From a paper:
Nonstructural protein 5 (NS5) is essential for the replication of the flaviviral RNA genome. The N-terminal portion of NS5 contains a methyltransferase (MT), followed by a short linker that connects to the RNA-dependent RNA polymerase (RdRp). The MT adds the 5′ RNA cap structure to facilitate translation of the polyprotein and to decrease elicitation of the host innate immune response. The RdRp initiates RNA synthesis by a de novo mechanism wherein a single-nucleotide triphosphate serves as a primer for nucleotide polymerization.
To examine whether the interaction of the MT with the RdRp will affect RNA synthesis, we compared the RNA synthesis activity of NS5 to that of a truncated protein, Δ264, which lacks the MT. To better understand the difference in RNA synthesis by NS5 and the RdRp, we determined the crystal structure of Δ264 at 3.0 Å resolution. The asymmetric unit contains eight RdRps that exist in two conformations (referred to as conformation 1 and 2) that vary in the locations of motif G, Loop 21 (residues 312–323) and Loop 51 (residues 742–750) that connect the thumb and fingers subdomains. The two conformations are affected by residue Arg483 that lies in the template channel. In conformation 1, the side chain of Arg483 inserts between motifs B and F and interacts with the carbonyl backbone of Gly604 and Trp476. In conformation 2, the locations of motifs B and F prevents the insertion of the side chain of Arg483. Instead, Arg483 interacts with Ala409 of motif G. NS5 that had the two aspartates in motif C replaced with alanines was unable to direct RNA synthesis either by de novo initiation or by elongation from a primed template. Δ264 synthesized approximately half of the de novo-initiated RNA product as did full-length NS5. However, with the template that directs elongative RNA synthesis, Δ264 synthesized sevenfold less product than did NS5. The RdRp alone was also competent for RNA synthesis, but was less active for RNA synthesis in vitro.
Author numbering: 268 to 891
The structure:
């Protein structure tokens, strides 16, 4: 019910450009629903999104028992219509978290500037080049063109090979260096998901926003070194884990459990991106004091004009079926699709958890909440304990797992709530619940189990509820996708299961069915997960038994005995209790029928794709 006071001198340039590039249809809506955001104007626009997602036909026909399981059919029920997005905005994005008291702002100031120093000892900030951007971007990124001069392209790889795209970039950078910002504007779309189960992970209603491709280069140019040089990697950050895949996250949770201390706390912040305060964006900007003078100017141009002052375009339903685009402003919060969204969240989250250990270890008191009593004590505790507490953390974005020195961590909440990083689904002052067994700790939408191998070895495999994995695969990201295109996406989900969730009985059988129903020569396409830890080693025509040995045996630094595994039958499953607990259907009437007649179902899918294609029998590589 307060703010914004829009800094019109910084954002007003882009406002009048969007206004005057639509000056015939620009108007001011008196009935706009934006309470905590700064409204600027509206103009007519076509509709976008869909009330429901299309279902992958190949995966659906090969997963009949789950047509009645609400846990998997609900994942395809995402809503992206302008009405569905506005329902998310008024609930999760149109908020205002009160300012932390002055004493709390001091701790964040001290700890943040301390971590940037530790993070930049073995590393050196630098500018990122044009060729680094051309090699990193995939053929189909988000073009995100919003202006007239920016809609000259159709694909992302097409733009980067055109000297015209790098001409618009040079002008905006020259606009930045002169003190203005002319074209860095966010596109915002929303997803309202019909959800969920009790403790189902990963997917909730959220807002997705990103800038256009040229703006994200200037973003990647000034601060892209955080991702390219692996500043949030575990080797350099201690508590980070950037770069490690789902085949390695389990070992860290096990590594932490052996160290002495209390329980393992994996509390989850509700709406982490929205809970970012204007003081945290200042503390994240402390990295600017380590850059060369040419770099420092480019960085502040991105920070002041893209991070600390944002302009967003949002759709909204109007009268008579027509829709309309809104222009709004916001000074705090984090855009979900900023180039360094993951790195800046991992940093801030490390600072938050570092502070929470202080409140538990009786370093900070309620005195310090409203005014720092003795600020000389904060820097002392960080140098004799700060790095020891980072190495007992695992932070990936807004996901964190902390191993405190004792169980006073569960009650250290006053500094946490004042910083706005409130916990999800808990009373404001109820102590946090901890985990005694690391194999139950949630982290990155997964728990991690220890799989004992046939020859006396062991890997730590990732695991999650089975309905979330089948439901995701049954989703086709767009209409008009061909039969071949949907089959290649089905092959990607199947071969991903063969690499990470092979220990699940239903997933290995369904994967062998999909691989037996999709032609053997066809190259898998698509994106099976948007998580940073899904490195995508399954996107290949290579024999999945070969790639299994590479990520679990050959290149596993936790596996000293590197003797290869020859058969798929030599790799066990989880215990039937653990498999059933995570959503398996072993023993049920319809699942047993589906397993018996899976060859008949695979043969029918083969006829949809074509009798002419060459197929392989991956079901005969499994007898049990
Ligand atoms: Zn700009
Ligand atoms: Zn499990």
């Amino acid at each position: 019910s307060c703010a914004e006071a829009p800094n019109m001198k910084i954002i007003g340039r882009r406002i009048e450009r969007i206004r005057n590039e639509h000056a015939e249809t620009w108007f001011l809506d008196e009935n706009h629903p934006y309470r905590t955001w700064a409204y600027h104007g509206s103009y007519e626009a076509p509709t976008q999104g869909s009330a429901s997602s299309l279902v992958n036909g190949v995966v659906r026909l090969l997963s009949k028992p789950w047509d009645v399981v609400t846990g998997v059919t609900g994942i395809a029920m995402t809503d992206t219509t302008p009405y569905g997005q506005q329902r998310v905005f008024k609930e999760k994005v149109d908020t205002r978290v009160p300012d932390p008291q002055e004493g709390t702002r001091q701790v964040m100031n001290i700890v943040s500037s301390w971590l940037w120093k530790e993070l930049g000892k073995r590393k050196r900030p630098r500018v990122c080049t044009k060729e680094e951007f051309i090699n990193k971007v995939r053929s189909n990124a988000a073009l995100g063109a919003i202006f007239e001069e920016e809609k000259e392209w159709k694909t992302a790889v097409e733009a980067v090979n055109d000297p015209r795209f790098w001409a618009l970039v040079d002008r905006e950078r020259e606009h930045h260096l002169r003190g203005e910002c002319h074209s860095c504007v966010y596109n915002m779309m929303g997803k309202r998901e019909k959800k969920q189960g009790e403790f189902g992970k990963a997917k909730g209603s959220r807002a997705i926003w990103y800038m256009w491709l040229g703006a994200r280069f200037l973003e990647f140019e000034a601060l892209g070194f955080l991702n390219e040089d692996h500043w949030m990697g575990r080797e350099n950050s201690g508590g980070g884990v950037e770069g490690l895949g789902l085949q390695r996250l389990g070992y860290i949770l096990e590594e932490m459990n052996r160290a002495p201390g209390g329980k393992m706390y994996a509390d989850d912040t509700a709406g982490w991106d929205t809970r970012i305060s204007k003081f945290d964006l200042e503390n994240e900007a402390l990295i600017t004091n380590q850059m060369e003078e040419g770099h420092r100017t480019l960085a502040l141009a991105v920070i002041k004009y893209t991070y600390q002052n944002k302009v967003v375009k949002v759709l909204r339903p109007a009268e008579g079926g027509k829709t309309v685009m809104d222009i709004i402003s916001r000074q705090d919060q984090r855009g979900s699709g900023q180039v360094v969204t993951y790195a800046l969240n991992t940093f801030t989250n490390l600072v938050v958890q570092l502070i929470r250990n202080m409140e538990a270890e009786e370093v900070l008191e309620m005195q310090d909440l409203w005014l720092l009593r003795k600020p000389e004590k904060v820097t002392r505790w960080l140098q004799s304990n700060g790095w020891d507490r980072l190495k007992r953390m695992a932070v990936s974005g807004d996901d964190c797992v902390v191993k405190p020195i004792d169980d006073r961590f569960a009650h250290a909440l006053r500094f946490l709530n004042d910083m706005g990083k409130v916990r999800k689904d808990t009373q404001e002052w109820k102590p946090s619940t901890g985990w005694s067994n690391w194999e139950e700790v949630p982290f990155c939408s997964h728990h991690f189990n220890k799989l004992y191998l046939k020859d006396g070895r062991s890997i730590v495999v990732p695991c999650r509820h089975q309905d979330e994995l089948i439901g995701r695969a049954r989703v086709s990201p767009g209409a008009g996708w061909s039969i071949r295109e949907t089959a290649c996406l089905a092959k990607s989900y199947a071969q991903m299961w063969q690499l990470l969730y092979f220990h699940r009985r239903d997933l290995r059988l369904m994967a062998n069915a999909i691989c037996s129903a999709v032609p053997v020569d066809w190259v898998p396409t698509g994106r099976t997960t948007w998580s940073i830890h899904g490195k995508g080693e399954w996107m290949t025509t290579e024999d999945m038994l070969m790639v299994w040995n590479r990520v679990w045996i050959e290149e596993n630094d936790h596996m000293e005995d590197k003797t290869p595994v020859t058969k798929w039958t030599d790799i066990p499953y989880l215990g039937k209790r653990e498999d059933l607990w995570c959503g398996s259907l072993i023993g049920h009437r319809p699942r047993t029928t589906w397993a018996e007649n899976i060859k008949d179902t695979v043969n029918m899918v083969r006829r949809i794709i074509g009798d002419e294609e060459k197929y392989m029998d991956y079901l005969s590589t499994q007898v049990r």
